[PDB]
Amino acid sequence: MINILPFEIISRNTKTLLITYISSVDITHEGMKKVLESLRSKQGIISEYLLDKLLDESLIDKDKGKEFLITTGVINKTKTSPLWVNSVIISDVPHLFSNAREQWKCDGVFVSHIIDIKDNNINVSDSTLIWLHLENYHSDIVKRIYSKFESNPGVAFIQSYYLKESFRIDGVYSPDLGTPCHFCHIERWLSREEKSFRRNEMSWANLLQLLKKYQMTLPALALGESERGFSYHLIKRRLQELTGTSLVKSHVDNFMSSVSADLITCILCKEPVIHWQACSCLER
Amino acid sequence: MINILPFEIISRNTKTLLITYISSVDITHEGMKKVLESLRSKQGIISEYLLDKLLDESLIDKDKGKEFLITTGVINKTKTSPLWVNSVIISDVPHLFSNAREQWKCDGVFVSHIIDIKDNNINVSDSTLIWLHLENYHSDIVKRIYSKFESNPGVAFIQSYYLKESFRIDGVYSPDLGTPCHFCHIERWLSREEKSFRRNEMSWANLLQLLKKYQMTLPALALGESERGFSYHLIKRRLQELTGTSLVKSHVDNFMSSVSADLITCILCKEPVIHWQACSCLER
Amino acid sequence: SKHELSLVEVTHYTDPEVLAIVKDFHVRGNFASLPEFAERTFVSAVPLAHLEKFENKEVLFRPGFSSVINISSSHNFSRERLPSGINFCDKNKLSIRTIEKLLVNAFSSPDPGSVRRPYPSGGALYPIEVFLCRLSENTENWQAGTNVYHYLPLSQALEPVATCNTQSLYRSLSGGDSERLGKPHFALVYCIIFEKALFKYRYRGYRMALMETGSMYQNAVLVADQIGLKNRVWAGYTDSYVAKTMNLDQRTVAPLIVQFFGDVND
């Protein structure tokens, strides 16, 4: 698979410059200028057949042209069959994502569907990453999605939601891989927010609450357009890390971990959470 | 009331030399040596009453004395109230901010105008923070904004622009306060590349200097909607940090700090900004 | 079995603050190591080309100085440890007799009526469990279709654990580097029971449990060398996926290290 990476190709008078994340080149060949311009107007992935055709049309040797494009940071070639063949976004604000499927292709991210949580009869295919994004959080929504899809072969989930002044993105929940679920995450954050000066969350006050039907909403600051935009970018980059055009590799010790962002300071904190002792995700 | 700026006095028998951030002065009056020795031991702060007393005790006319202290950079007179009554955004992408003035009121941020950088005749009121935001960076754009507005009473400037995979927000440049400018960073950085002990022949300074020669701007690399939403939120929060601020209860480090955001990882790096002795902002 | 301890008895002494803090730390070292993540993750923070300068070196108490007391190698009566196996090949059948020999010599007393083991343990608590994973259909089996067992070192017996197929186990244990690993016959997986490591000594018990694991795999290295098996200790696996595949409960027990065994020919 050939991935087109971020770059610009700019021109003034007889001067043409290529600028990528890796390098900058004063371009002196008209054919390669043409190739770069066509690549710049395409989104993310290009068939090697079309790349070859593009190079042939500009009378450029395919091997030498490809080597130039790869070494300068215009394209890369990936080989790996990925773990989730598709992503879906399920949300209570699907309109926030109404352009995401088409935009995010140029980051190499395949999102097949934006699904409104209000939909009855939601279907998802094999080996799909399900991103559940909630502005108006309720634990029952997460429980419904798990109840419907946890048994889907190769499924995984990511959940995103707001808590106090933060945007939270849970670690990837993969039943196949045995990683912690949303409830493992939200209990870790609720514990940390208690002013107990204690890591341990359990006491008789907590045990008595665990008698009631497990359900909750979460306090959070009111969202404006800028908080939504920030969130939108974090979602995109996270999906990109997992399933899209990889620009920066992640260390194996934190690739599937949670990502939390303080909406005031804009500082991110990426943290692996443990399985919550009272959660049954491990037993399913 | 009065901020005492950092300075030195060196004495040799009856010879005294004063050096501030902007001046070097032979001090031959005994009274003024006593005023300066006192201010040097006071450590940042003094009331108008104590300054007036100190001047009277040293037999120096209060108005001549204070004009000297201000002009040579020993003191600055600044307000307890907010330094900037409002902000304007000047941009090459003003349509990005078409709802910012209305939206950001609920965050307590008051932006009075969004201004296209291509407008011929840009006017800005007194005591206004000018935020210059560029997707297409050229140093002469910043130079022309500085030349237009540096003498506006109470003015300050902040610049935001893109450097490869990073979005940079400069420190606050305030002529009144004597904080570093855009060029204290970028021209000093270019100096260090040009004057490297062993030049890196593949320095990014080569690109920047070639863009000057070719009369071209440095474009932001392949920005989409999400990168712009991320930038929009960072701008909002930085403006919020600068709102209601003064030397009365906001440290000078709030102004003399830059924020760089890697657009791939979404990680922010907040760094100190210092003066460059060679900068033209110090020719005063 | 005659030596059974219920974890109910252990948890009576557990400090839940210690347990949580230890688990929180422990999970920072877990890996997501899968073939499908090869182009988007990395393991070494040092580039491959610079690793040579760090491998098989000595750090000095007085850097820059060379005044040392030399010791003669004529006092050495030992065999060289064999190179760790790699590019394992499973073409030949491997008998249960060979695996049994590994287990009893590495982890058990020669006397079946004794409760002492060939490795010590803080407070004689022995918080590390050994699991046996069958990884090739060319490995003989005790119970048809059972590919994970738990070794009971005092009973000198194997307890059936899981009937996952040999391919699922192999995938989980070998992580991203399975092509280079090749095809081992079996693995040992050494697992910490958190509450058994912590209940007496608190935080220091974690440190003691990890050290104990190393004493255990080292016995296995030495025994394996003597019986003509090749072996490699291995950290390149996805901890949670190994746990799930073995049907371990990650709230109680976590895999610390994997050790592959087999032949190296072609």
Binding site: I22, H29, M32 | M202, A205 | -
Partner: peptide
């Protein structure tokens, strides 16, 4: 390397090494 296509002006060596 020098190429027929243009002159390389700048390289981010850290990112090139990772494109390890």
């Amino acid at each position: 390397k020098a190429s027929e296509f243009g002159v390389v002006l700048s390289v981010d060596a850290l990112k090139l090494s990772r494109q390890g």
